[PDB]
Amino acid sequence: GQKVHPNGIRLGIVKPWNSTWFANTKEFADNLDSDFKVRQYLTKELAKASVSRIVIERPAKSIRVTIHTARPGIVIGKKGEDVEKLRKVVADIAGVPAQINIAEVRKPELDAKLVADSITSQLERRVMFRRAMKRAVQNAMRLGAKGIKVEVSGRLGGAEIARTEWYREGRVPLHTLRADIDYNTSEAHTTYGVIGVKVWIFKGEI
Amino acid sequence: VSMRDMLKAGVHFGHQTRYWNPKMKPFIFGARNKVHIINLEKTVPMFNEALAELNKIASRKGKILFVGTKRAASEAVKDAALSCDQFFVNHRWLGGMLTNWKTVRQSIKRLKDLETQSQDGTFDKLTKKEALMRTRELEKLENSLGGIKDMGGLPDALFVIDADHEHIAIKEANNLGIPVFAIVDTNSDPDGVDFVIPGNDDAIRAVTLYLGAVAATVREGRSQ
Amino acid sequence: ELQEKLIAVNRVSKTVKGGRIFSFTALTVVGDGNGRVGFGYGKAREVPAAIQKAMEKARRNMINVALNNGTLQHPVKGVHTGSRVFMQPASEGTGIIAGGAMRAVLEVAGVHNVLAKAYGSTNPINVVRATIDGLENMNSPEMVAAKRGKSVEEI
RNA sequence: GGCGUAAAGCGCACGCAGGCGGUUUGUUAAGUCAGAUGUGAAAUCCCCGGGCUCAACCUGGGAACUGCAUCUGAUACUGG
RNA sequence: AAGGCGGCCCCCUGGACGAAGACUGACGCUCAGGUGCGAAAGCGUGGGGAGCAAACAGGAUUAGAUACCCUGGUAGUCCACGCCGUAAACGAUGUCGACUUGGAGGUUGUGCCCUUGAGGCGUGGCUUCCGGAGCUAACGCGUUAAGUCGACCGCCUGGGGA
RNA sequence: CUGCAUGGCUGUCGUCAGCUCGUGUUGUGAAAUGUUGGGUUAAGUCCCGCAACGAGCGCAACCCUUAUCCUUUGUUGCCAG
């Protein structure tokens, strides 16, 4: 069977939204198309910087991007230098005057997006896929993830037929709404087409 | 520990002839009313042979485990293990207490959560069903693992009332290389048992006699 | 400390509604190069999981055997199921001249010099049973001195 | 090496040739065992040497030719 | 002995088993070739023929129904005397002998016991079901072995062809 | 062009009560046991048993809506006195 998206069923229960601005119907489609391009930019720039999550709010006129990332140093560059040359190409893309922030991520082993990006990276430099999965599971479980499954898919070690090996460890309860199930996803672009990588990460409940 | 005393209990009495193991042919006198009679000039050397080693185990601080999930012998074994401060089993022997210890020591760990977390943190977060759906788990764990809870590792000996009923226990002990002592009726098998002690195991004052002697010779070993 | 071969790895299978659940057996012997030998036989759904379950099952489950200068006492037979197995002590510098699964068992047992021969089946699992069956019933000159109550020039 | 189900127990009996034969003492010495002599061609094989620069190749001495016969003993087992 | 043997009565007759004693004194076991016995069907000569019933006939059923089902029905089934020599003729387990823990029964003898009860204590023979060690690929066999041995015989050596 | 090289997304058996693992144990082994049995439930739901002891994904609950009441708050909604 097909599963509901575990982020999406849990919005306004235990997960919060990422675009958190109000509009009326004139300017709604435009805000969406701005917020798309401000994310489609900041993903392409900060690929090395290890970015979990780009929140956007819109107070007043102005746009306010928070970034969450494993590596604050490489975004802030030196004296900002890089923060401040992000702002003035963001503030074109919005139209309004901008404001970038940063947060850490303390445990990059427990973010779904970063675990997936990680695994997806290793698969493009031709690492054996069972090692790449199984490192990632161990790493989360020694830093106290209550559980974690990962699930790669489709031409693994350059086979001619697609398969999906997956590998749980601990508890991962996806029909429990109360459960914080950090989830995310990534495509590895290899010489054998794409390989897709899901990652769930239970962290406990309420 | 006297042949006089043993005859007053009923240690000579067996099972009916029908139900014998022929491996117990050396430890038999003969039949009356079609019932086998245990030779007690075989018992008394073999009992005082065994209580030699129960003292010599208990001297060097080694843990005895009493076993008796006969309904006759159950309250005897509980009582007679708490006299010497050794460990016991009287509800169900669990398939793989000893061989699968590493797993069982979780449901010990669980019994030492639910006794403490209760009394002392007293829960008083409830729901009210979940107050007594822990009292129903703490009851059912106490029966099963109340005896062995403090043991902290494998025992250095077993003591087994009825070989034939508690055959799972004896069989487990001979994987691990633990010495086994057993009370062995005419109907029972001696083969796994290291020090066999032939005897009635059915009647209650028969059982109380043996545990009398073993209680005694553990405490004398413990005290030194 | 101790030496540890991998003999064989089957894939076995089990049918269900879905189709086939594949699974791997491995088969290992360990030994102290000096007259102790276990064998263990693991199963798991991955292959390195199974070798590991076998290496554990072999360490516990492991038996003594009195060799003589790195070869047998006397010419032994041995049998389990289809596999019959004859082994014969040899002069120094033969090497282990011996079959498939036999050859593993004898190397880590610390036999250096034998003439083996497997008749019958040569199913790896039943041959390492038959080989160990052989080696454990085989009996020293000091054991038979004791049996009969002697200690002669037969010693 | 097998023969209940994989190939394999005659449908069942009687029974001649054949094979096998309880226990004891004596005797015989056919089988059996031990010893001795005769023969078992030379080459070949195997061992220790020697000669071709080495090796193949050649060669000295031995062992072997598990056999057959005759003679003298042994007599537990088999046979008479 | 196997094939097999079933109302009651008579006549002729084979074997088995048990008890106590007497008698011969290894007279034994197995058996290629040989001789005998050998269900049912079938064949021969002559009787018999109720019921049943291959063939055959009609009726149904059915796409068809040369069948299953129905109504009939001939050989055959029965007796006598001959042949045929075969069967999943099977315990799918050659015969003879010895040894190796138990339990529950059945059948048929026999000896001791206030027979005091249709009973208590033993001792033979045949037989049914469980199951131990051991054996076996396993299923299972398991003192009536497929366990541990010995004697003689028969037979097997990929599937089809056959 | 190839869904018969792929990712992603979806239908389907089916909101059916199932599907598995670890450690132990039995078996030369594939495997088995657990997961079966006696009750019961919408439910491998729960209890009792039993060479099994435990764990996970599912079931259930945690979410939205509807069914009664209370508290607060009354315009653009309401009108008992």
Side-chain angles (χ1 to χ4, degrees), chain B residues 92 95-96 99-100 103 107 140 175:
Chain B
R92 216 159 59 79
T99 53
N100 190 31
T103 305
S107 275
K140 201 153 57 52
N175 298 15

PDB file of all heavy atoms in Angstrom, chain B residues 92 95-96 99-100 103 107 140 175, chain F residues 23-25 48 50-54:
ATOM      1  N   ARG B  92       5.409 -22.028  37.201  1.00  0.00           N
ATOM      2  CA  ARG B  92       6.064 -22.398  35.928  1.00  0.00           C
ATOM      3  C   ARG B  92       7.576 -22.162  35.853  1.00  0.00           C
ATOM      4  O   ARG B  92       8.056 -21.029  36.005  1.00  0.00           O
ATOM      5  CB  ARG B  92       5.388 -21.682  34.739  1.00  0.00           C
ATOM      6  CG  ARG B  92       5.311 -22.523  33.462  1.00  0.00           C
ATOM      7  CD  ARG B  92       4.232 -22.017  32.516  1.00  0.00           C
ATOM      8  NE  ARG B  92       4.474 -20.628  32.142  1.00  0.00           N
ATOM      9  CZ  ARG B  92       5.355 -20.213  31.236  1.00  0.00           C
ATOM     10  NH1 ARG B  92       6.110 -21.069  30.545  1.00  0.00           N
ATOM     11  NH2 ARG B  92       5.473 -18.912  31.009  1.00  0.00           N
ATOM     12  N   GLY B  95      10.676 -22.349  30.037  1.00  0.00           N
ATOM     13  CA  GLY B  95      11.476 -22.709  28.864  1.00  0.00           C
ATOM     14  C   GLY B  95      12.615 -21.727  28.667  1.00  0.00           C
ATOM     15  O   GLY B  95      12.425 -20.624  28.138  1.00  0.00           O
ATOM     16  N   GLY B  96      13.785 -22.117  29.157  1.00  0.00           N
ATOM     17  CA  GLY B  96      15.007 -21.354  28.972  1.00  0.00           C
ATOM     18  C   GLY B  96      15.189 -20.237  29.972  1.00  0.00           C
ATOM     19  O   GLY B  96      15.551 -19.126  29.588  1.00  0.00           O
ATOM     20  N   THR B  99      19.388 -21.385  30.011  1.00  0.00           N
ATOM     21  CA  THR B  99      20.028 -21.343  28.689  1.00  0.00           C
ATOM     22  C   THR B  99      19.847 -19.978  28.026  1.00  0.00           C
ATOM     23  O   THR B  99      20.796 -19.421  27.469  1.00  0.00           O
ATOM     24  CB  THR B  99      19.497 -22.431  27.729  1.00  0.00           C
ATOM     25  OG1 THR B  99      18.065 -22.379  27.659  1.00  0.00           O
ATOM     26  CG2 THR B  99      19.935 -23.807  28.178  1.00  0.00           C
ATOM     27  N   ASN B 100      18.624 -19.454  28.115  1.00  0.00           N
ATOM     28  CA  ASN B 100      18.285 -18.118  27.647  1.00  0.00           C
ATOM     29  C   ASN B 100      18.136 -17.192  28.841  1.00  0.00           C
ATOM     30  O   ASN B 100      17.080 -16.593  29.047  1.00  0.00           O
ATOM     31  CB  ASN B 100      16.993 -18.183  26.808  1.00  0.00           C
ATOM     32  CG  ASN B 100      16.670 -16.878  26.071  1.00  0.00           C
ATOM     33  OD1 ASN B 100      17.555 -16.117  25.669  1.00  0.00           O
ATOM     34  ND2 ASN B 100      15.377 -16.633  25.873  1.00  0.00           N
ATOM     35  N   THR B 103      18.067 -13.105  27.934  1.00  0.00           N
ATOM     36  CA  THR B 103      16.721 -12.585  27.689  1.00  0.00           C
ATOM     37  C   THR B 103      15.867 -12.439  28.938  1.00  0.00           C
ATOM     38  O   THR B 103      15.159 -11.447  29.089  1.00  0.00           O
ATOM     39  CB  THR B 103      15.947 -13.518  26.753  1.00  0.00           C
ATOM     40  OG1 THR B 103      16.690 -13.710  25.543  1.00  0.00           O
ATOM     41  CG2 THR B 103      14.573 -12.937  26.425  1.00  0.00           C
ATOM     42  N   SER B 107      13.103  -9.366  32.107  1.00  0.00           N
ATOM     43  CA  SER B 107      11.880  -9.477  32.925  1.00  0.00           C
ATOM     44  C   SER B 107      12.177  -9.544  34.435  1.00  0.00           C
ATOM     45  O   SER B 107      11.260  -9.445  35.252  1.00  0.00           O
ATOM     46  CB  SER B 107      11.011 -10.676  32.487  1.00  0.00           C
ATOM     47  OG  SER B 107      10.150 -10.338  31.406  1.00  0.00           O
ATOM     48  N   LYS B 140       1.920 -11.000  38.224  1.00  0.00           N
ATOM     49  CA  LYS B 140       2.210 -12.119  37.323  1.00  0.00           C
ATOM     50  C   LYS B 140       3.716 -12.314  37.090  1.00  0.00           C
ATOM     51  O   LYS B 140       4.151 -13.424  36.766  1.00  0.00           O
ATOM     52  CB  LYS B 140       1.484 -11.908  35.986  1.00  0.00           C
ATOM     53  CG  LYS B 140       1.271 -13.168  35.154  1.00  0.00           C
ATOM     54  CD  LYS B 140       0.052 -13.059  34.233  1.00  0.00           C
ATOM     55  CE  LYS B 140       0.111 -11.868  33.278  1.00  0.00           C
ATOM     56  NZ  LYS B 140       1.381 -11.795  32.504  1.00  0.00           N
ATOM     57  N   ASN B 175      23.049 -28.794  29.609  1.00  0.00           N
ATOM     58  CA  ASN B 175      23.706 -27.994  28.561  1.00  0.00           C
ATOM     59  C   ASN B 175      24.815 -27.151  29.151  1.00  0.00           C
ATOM     60  O   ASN B 175      25.912 -27.077  28.602  1.00  0.00           O
ATOM     61  CB  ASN B 175      22.709 -27.075  27.851  1.00  0.00           C
ATOM     62  CG  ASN B 175      21.606 -27.836  27.135  1.00  0.00           C
ATOM     63  OD1 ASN B 175      21.397 -29.030  27.366  1.00  0.00           O
ATOM     64  ND2 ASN B 175      20.883 -27.141  26.265  1.00  0.00           N
TER      65      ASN B 175
ATOM     66  P     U F  23      20.389 -14.027  17.433  1.00  0.00           P
ATOM     67  OP1   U F  23      21.812 -13.749  17.119  1.00  0.00           O
ATOM     68  OP2   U F  23      19.590 -14.863  16.493  1.00  0.00           O
ATOM     69  O5'   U F  23      20.291 -14.675  18.885  1.00  0.00           O
ATOM     70  C5'   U F  23      20.776 -13.984  20.058  1.00  0.00           C
ATOM     71  C4'   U F  23      20.102 -14.511  21.306  1.00  0.00           C
ATOM     72  O4'   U F  23      18.709 -14.089  21.347  1.00  0.00           O
ATOM     73  C3'   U F  23      20.005 -16.024  21.449  1.00  0.00           C
ATOM     74  O3'   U F  23      21.227 -16.671  21.792  1.00  0.00           O
ATOM     75  C2'   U F  23      18.924 -16.147  22.514  1.00  0.00           C
ATOM     76  O2'   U F  23      19.402 -15.984  23.833  1.00  0.00           O
ATOM     77  C1'   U F  23      17.951 -15.048  22.075  1.00  0.00           C
ATOM     78  N1    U F  23      16.895 -15.600  21.209  1.00  0.00           N
ATOM     79  C2    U F  23      15.822 -16.217  21.825  1.00  0.00           C
ATOM     80  O2    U F  23      15.689 -16.265  23.035  1.00  0.00           O
ATOM     81  N3    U F  23      14.894 -16.752  20.972  1.00  0.00           N
ATOM     82  C4    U F  23      14.937 -16.764  19.599  1.00  0.00           C
ATOM     83  O4    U F  23      14.028 -17.303  18.969  1.00  0.00           O
ATOM     84  C5    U F  23      16.085 -16.123  19.035  1.00  0.00           C
ATOM     85  C6    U F  23      17.011 -15.594  19.841  1.00  0.00           C
ATOM     86  P     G F  24      21.384 -18.266  21.595  1.00  0.00           P
ATOM     87  OP1   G F  24      22.627 -18.688  22.289  1.00  0.00           O
ATOM     88  OP2   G F  24      21.201 -18.605  20.156  1.00  0.00           O
ATOM     89  O5'   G F  24      20.117 -18.850  22.353  1.00  0.00           O
ATOM     90  C5'   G F  24      20.284 -19.572  23.568  1.00  0.00           C
ATOM     91  C4'   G F  24      18.955 -20.033  24.098  1.00  0.00           C
ATOM     92  O4'   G F  24      17.876 -19.194  23.603  1.00  0.00           O
ATOM     93  C3'   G F  24      18.522 -21.425  23.685  1.00  0.00           C
ATOM     94  O3'   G F  24      19.260 -22.433  24.367  1.00  0.00           O
ATOM     95  C2'   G F  24      17.039 -21.361  24.017  1.00  0.00           C
ATOM     96  O2'   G F  24      16.775 -21.449  25.403  1.00  0.00           O
ATOM     97  C1'   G F  24      16.694 -19.975  23.473  1.00  0.00           C
ATOM     98  N9    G F  24      16.292 -19.993  22.067  1.00  0.00           N
ATOM     99  C8    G F  24      16.946 -19.441  20.989  1.00  0.00           C
ATOM    100  N7    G F  24      16.326 -19.640  19.857  1.00  0.00           N
ATOM    101  C5    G F  24      15.185 -20.347  20.212  1.00  0.00           C
ATOM    102  C6    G F  24      14.125 -20.839  19.412  1.00  0.00           C
ATOM    103  O6    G F  24      13.970 -20.739  18.190  1.00  0.00           O
ATOM    104  N1    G F  24      13.178 -21.510  20.177  1.00  0.00           N
ATOM    105  C2    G F  24      13.242 -21.686  21.535  1.00  0.00           C
ATOM    106  N2    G F  24      12.225 -22.355  22.094  1.00  0.00           N
ATOM    107  N3    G F  24      14.227 -21.238  22.290  1.00  0.00           N
ATOM    108  C4    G F  24      15.159 -20.584  21.569  1.00  0.00           C
ATOM    109  P     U F  25      20.007 -23.596  23.547  1.00  0.00           P
ATOM    110  OP1   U F  25      20.896 -24.300  24.501  1.00  0.00           O
ATOM    111  OP2   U F  25      20.587 -23.005  22.315  1.00  0.00           O
ATOM    112  O5'   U F  25      18.822 -24.595  23.173  1.00  0.00           O
ATOM    113  C5'   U F  25      18.097 -25.261  24.221  1.00  0.00           C
ATOM    114  C4'   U F  25      16.708 -25.669  23.792  1.00  0.00           C
ATOM    115  O4'   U F  25      15.966 -24.526  23.291  1.00  0.00           O
ATOM    116  C3'   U F  25      16.636 -26.683  22.665  1.00  0.00           C
ATOM    117  O3'   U F  25      16.923 -27.986  23.154  1.00  0.00           O
ATOM    118  C2'   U F  25      15.218 -26.464  22.148  1.00  0.00           C
ATOM    119  O2'   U F  25      14.144 -27.073  22.842  1.00  0.00           O
ATOM    120  C1'   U F  25      15.125 -24.937  22.218  1.00  0.00           C
ATOM    121  N1    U F  25      15.567 -24.280  20.973  1.00  0.00           N
ATOM    122  C2    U F  25      14.750 -24.402  19.866  1.00  0.00           C
ATOM    123  O2    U F  25      13.693 -25.009  19.887  1.00  0.00           O
ATOM    124  N3    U F  25      15.218 -23.790  18.733  1.00  0.00           N
ATOM    125  C4    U F  25      16.393 -23.085  18.589  1.00  0.00           C
ATOM    126  O4    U F  25      16.670 -22.579  17.501  1.00  0.00           O
ATOM    127  C5    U F  25      17.188 -23.011  19.775  1.00  0.00           C
ATOM    128  C6    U F  25      16.762 -23.599  20.897  1.00  0.00           C
ATOM    129  P     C F  48      -3.330 -14.233  33.044  1.00  0.00           P
ATOM    130  OP1   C F  48      -3.070 -14.096  34.499  1.00  0.00           O
ATOM    131  OP2   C F  48      -2.274 -13.818  32.087  1.00  0.00           O
ATOM    132  O5'   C F  48      -3.770 -15.741  32.759  1.00  0.00           O
ATOM    133  C5'   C F  48      -4.672 -16.426  33.654  1.00  0.00           C
ATOM    134  C4'   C F  48      -5.035 -17.818  33.168  1.00  0.00           C
ATOM    135  O4'   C F  48      -5.749 -17.761  31.901  1.00  0.00           O
ATOM    136  C3'   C F  48      -3.887 -18.776  32.888  1.00  0.00           C
ATOM    137  O3'   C F  48      -3.292 -19.393  34.021  1.00  0.00           O
ATOM    138  C2'   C F  48      -4.569 -19.815  32.011  1.00  0.00           C
ATOM    139  O2'   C F  48      -5.261 -20.801  32.749  1.00  0.00           O
ATOM    140  C1'   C F  48      -5.455 -18.926  31.137  1.00  0.00           C
ATOM    141  N1    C F  48      -4.765 -18.530  29.888  1.00  0.00           N
ATOM    142  C2    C F  48      -4.807 -19.400  28.791  1.00  0.00           C
ATOM    143  O2    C F  48      -5.451 -20.454  28.886  1.00  0.00           O
ATOM    144  N3    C F  48      -4.151 -19.064  27.656  1.00  0.00           N
ATOM    145  C4    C F  48      -3.465 -17.920  27.595  1.00  0.00           C
ATOM    146  N4    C F  48      -2.841 -17.625  26.455  1.00  0.00           N
ATOM    147  C5    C F  48      -3.392 -17.025  28.701  1.00  0.00           C
ATOM    148  C6    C F  48      -4.043 -17.369  29.820  1.00  0.00           C
ATOM    149  P     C F  50       1.156 -25.149  32.049  1.00  0.00           P
ATOM    150  OP1   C F  50       1.256 -26.369  32.891  1.00  0.00           O
ATOM    151  OP2   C F  50       1.718 -23.858  32.532  1.00  0.00           O
ATOM    152  O5'   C F  50       1.856 -25.469  30.659  1.00  0.00           O
ATOM    153  C5'   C F  50       1.391 -26.512  29.786  1.00  0.00           C
ATOM    154  C4'   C F  50       1.989 -26.324  28.413  1.00  0.00           C
ATOM    155  O4'   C F  50       1.320 -25.225  27.741  1.00  0.00           O
ATOM    156  C3'   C F  50       3.459 -25.939  28.373  1.00  0.00           C
ATOM    157  O3'   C F  50       4.291 -27.083  28.520  1.00  0.00           O
ATOM    158  C2'   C F  50       3.580 -25.284  27.005  1.00  0.00           C
ATOM    159  O2'   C F  50       3.759 -26.221  25.965  1.00  0.00           O
ATOM    160  C1'   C F  50       2.236 -24.563  26.888  1.00  0.00           C
ATOM    161  N1    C F  50       2.324 -23.149  27.286  1.00  0.00           N
ATOM    162  C2    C F  50       2.633 -22.200  26.308  1.00  0.00           C
ATOM    163  O2    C F  50       2.793 -22.574  25.137  1.00  0.00           O
ATOM    164  N3    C F  50       2.759 -20.900  26.665  1.00  0.00           N
ATOM    165  C4    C F  50       2.583 -20.538  27.938  1.00  0.00           C
ATOM    166  N4    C F  50       2.700 -19.244  28.242  1.00  0.00           N
ATOM    167  C5    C F  50       2.278 -21.487  28.956  1.00  0.00           C
ATOM    168  C6    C F  50       2.172 -22.771  28.591  1.00  0.00           C
ATOM    169  P     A F  51       5.849 -26.902  28.812  1.00  0.00           P
ATOM    170  OP1   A F  51       6.444 -28.249  29.016  1.00  0.00           O
ATOM    171  OP2   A F  51       6.013 -25.856  29.855  1.00  0.00           O
ATOM    172  O5'   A F  51       6.395 -26.315  27.438  1.00  0.00           O
ATOM    173  C5'   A F  51       7.802 -26.283  27.173  1.00  0.00           C
ATOM    174  C4'   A F  51       8.107 -25.191  26.185  1.00  0.00           C
ATOM    175  O4'   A F  51       9.458 -24.700  26.426  1.00  0.00           O
ATOM    176  C3'   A F  51       8.096 -25.625  24.721  1.00  0.00           C
ATOM    177  O3'   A F  51       7.782 -24.504  23.876  1.00  0.00           O
ATOM    178  C2'   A F  51       9.546 -26.074  24.545  1.00  0.00           C
ATOM    179  O2'   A F  51      10.018 -26.191  23.220  1.00  0.00           O
ATOM    180  C1'   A F  51      10.260 -24.947  25.284  1.00  0.00           C
ATOM    181  N9    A F  51      11.624 -25.199  25.738  1.00  0.00           N
ATOM    182  C8    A F  51      12.149 -26.318  26.335  1.00  0.00           C
ATOM    183  N7    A F  51      13.411 -26.195  26.670  1.00  0.00           N
ATOM    184  C5    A F  51      13.733 -24.901  26.287  1.00  0.00           C
ATOM    185  C6    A F  51      14.923 -24.156  26.370  1.00  0.00           C
ATOM    186  N6    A F  51      16.060 -24.628  26.884  1.00  0.00           N
ATOM    187  N1    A F  51      14.907 -22.892  25.898  1.00  0.00           N
ATOM    188  C2    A F  51      13.770 -22.419  25.372  1.00  0.00           C
ATOM    189  N3    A F  51      12.591 -23.022  25.233  1.00  0.00           N
ATOM    190  C4    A F  51      12.639 -24.274  25.718  1.00  0.00           C
ATOM    191  P     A F  52       6.249 -24.065  23.533  1.00  0.00           P
ATOM    192  OP1   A F  52       5.407 -25.287  23.475  1.00  0.00           O
ATOM    193  OP2   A F  52       6.290 -23.172  22.350  1.00  0.00           O
ATOM    194  O5'   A F  52       5.825 -23.179  24.784  1.00  0.00           O
ATOM    195  C5'   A F  52       6.073 -21.757  24.826  1.00  0.00           C
ATOM    196  C4'   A F  52       7.308 -21.463  25.635  1.00  0.00           C
ATOM    197  O4'   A F  52       8.465 -21.921  24.896  1.00  0.00           O
ATOM    198  C3'   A F  52       7.580 -19.993  25.954  1.00  0.00           C
ATOM    199  O3'   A F  52       6.929 -19.581  27.163  1.00  0.00           O
ATOM    200  C2'   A F  52       9.099 -19.973  26.090  1.00  0.00           C
ATOM    201  O2'   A F  52       9.597 -20.379  27.349  1.00  0.00           O
ATOM    202  C1'   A F  52       9.516 -20.989  25.032  1.00  0.00           C
ATOM    203  N9    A F  52       9.801 -20.432  23.712  1.00  0.00           N
ATOM    204  C8    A F  52       9.106 -20.648  22.548  1.00  0.00           C
ATOM    205  N7    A F  52       9.635 -20.062  21.502  1.00  0.00           N
ATOM    206  C5    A F  52      10.764 -19.435  22.007  1.00  0.00           C
ATOM    207  C6    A F  52      11.750 -18.644  21.401  1.00  0.00           C
ATOM    208  N6    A F  52      11.755 -18.341  20.103  1.00  0.00           N
ATOM    209  N1    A F  52      12.728 -18.145  22.189  1.00  0.00           N
ATOM    210  C2    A F  52      12.722 -18.456  23.491  1.00  0.00           C
ATOM    211  N3    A F  52      11.853 -19.200  24.174  1.00  0.00           N
ATOM    212  C4    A F  52      10.883 -19.658  23.364  1.00  0.00           C
ATOM    213  P     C F  53       6.280 -18.100  27.297  1.00  0.00           P
ATOM    214  OP1   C F  53       5.515 -18.043  28.558  1.00  0.00           O
ATOM    215  OP2   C F  53       5.600 -17.770  26.024  1.00  0.00           O
ATOM    216  O5'   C F  53       7.542 -17.147  27.486  1.00  0.00           O
ATOM    217  C5'   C F  53       8.453 -17.359  28.578  1.00  0.00           C
ATOM    218  C4'   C F  53       9.675 -16.475  28.466  1.00  0.00           C
ATOM    219  O4'   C F  53      10.575 -16.966  27.436  1.00  0.00           O
ATOM    220  C3'   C F  53       9.427 -15.022  28.104  1.00  0.00           C
ATOM    221  O3'   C F  53       9.129 -14.278  29.271  1.00  0.00           O
ATOM    222  C2'   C F  53      10.774 -14.610  27.538  1.00  0.00           C
ATOM    223  O2'   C F  53      11.732 -14.286  28.525  1.00  0.00           O
ATOM    224  C1'   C F  53      11.170 -15.866  26.765  1.00  0.00           C
ATOM    225  N1    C F  53      10.726 -15.874  25.356  1.00  0.00           N
ATOM    226  C2    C F  53      11.536 -15.281  24.378  1.00  0.00           C
ATOM    227  O2    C F  53      12.594 -14.738  24.723  1.00  0.00           O
ATOM    228  N3    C F  53      11.152 -15.327  23.084  1.00  0.00           N
ATOM    229  C4    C F  53      10.004 -15.921  22.752  1.00  0.00           C
ATOM    230  N4    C F  53       9.653 -15.927  21.465  1.00  0.00           N
ATOM    231  C5    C F  53       9.161 -16.530  23.723  1.00  0.00           C
ATOM    232  C6    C F  53       9.554 -16.481  25.000  1.00  0.00           C
ATOM    233  P     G F  54       8.282 -12.940  29.171  1.00  0.00           P
ATOM    234  OP1   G F  54       8.155 -12.380  30.544  1.00  0.00           O
ATOM    235  OP2   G F  54       7.068 -13.229  28.362  1.00  0.00           O
ATOM    236  O5'   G F  54       9.258 -11.954  28.396  1.00  0.00           O
ATOM    237  C5'   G F  54       8.758 -11.013  27.434  1.00  0.00           C
ATOM    238  C4'   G F  54       9.906 -10.575  26.571  1.00  0.00           C
ATOM    239  O4'   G F  54      10.389 -11.716  25.814  1.00  0.00           O
ATOM    240  C3'   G F  54       9.606  -9.541  25.504  1.00  0.00           C
ATOM    241  O3'   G F  54       9.512  -8.232  26.064  1.00  0.00           O
ATOM    242  C2'   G F  54      10.781  -9.756  24.558  1.00  0.00           C
ATOM    243  O2'   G F  54      12.000  -9.206  25.015  1.00  0.00           O
ATOM    244  C1'   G F  54      10.875 -11.282  24.558  1.00  0.00           C
ATOM    245  N9    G F  54      10.081 -11.906  23.506  1.00  0.00           N
ATOM    246  C8    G F  54       8.935 -12.660  23.623  1.00  0.00           C
ATOM    247  N7    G F  54       8.466 -13.062  22.472  1.00  0.00           N
ATOM    248  C5    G F  54       9.353 -12.536  21.540  1.00  0.00           C
ATOM    249  C6    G F  54       9.375 -12.646  20.124  1.00  0.00           C
ATOM    250  O6    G F  54       8.582 -13.242  19.385  1.00  0.00           O
ATOM    251  N1    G F  54      10.454 -11.962  19.574  1.00  0.00           N
ATOM    252  C2    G F  54      11.400 -11.274  20.292  1.00  0.00           C
ATOM    253  N2    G F  54      12.374 -10.689  19.583  1.00  0.00           N
ATOM    254  N3    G F  54      11.392 -11.162  21.611  1.00  0.00           N
ATOM    255  C4    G F  54      10.351 -11.818  22.165  1.00  0.00           C
TER     256        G F  54
END
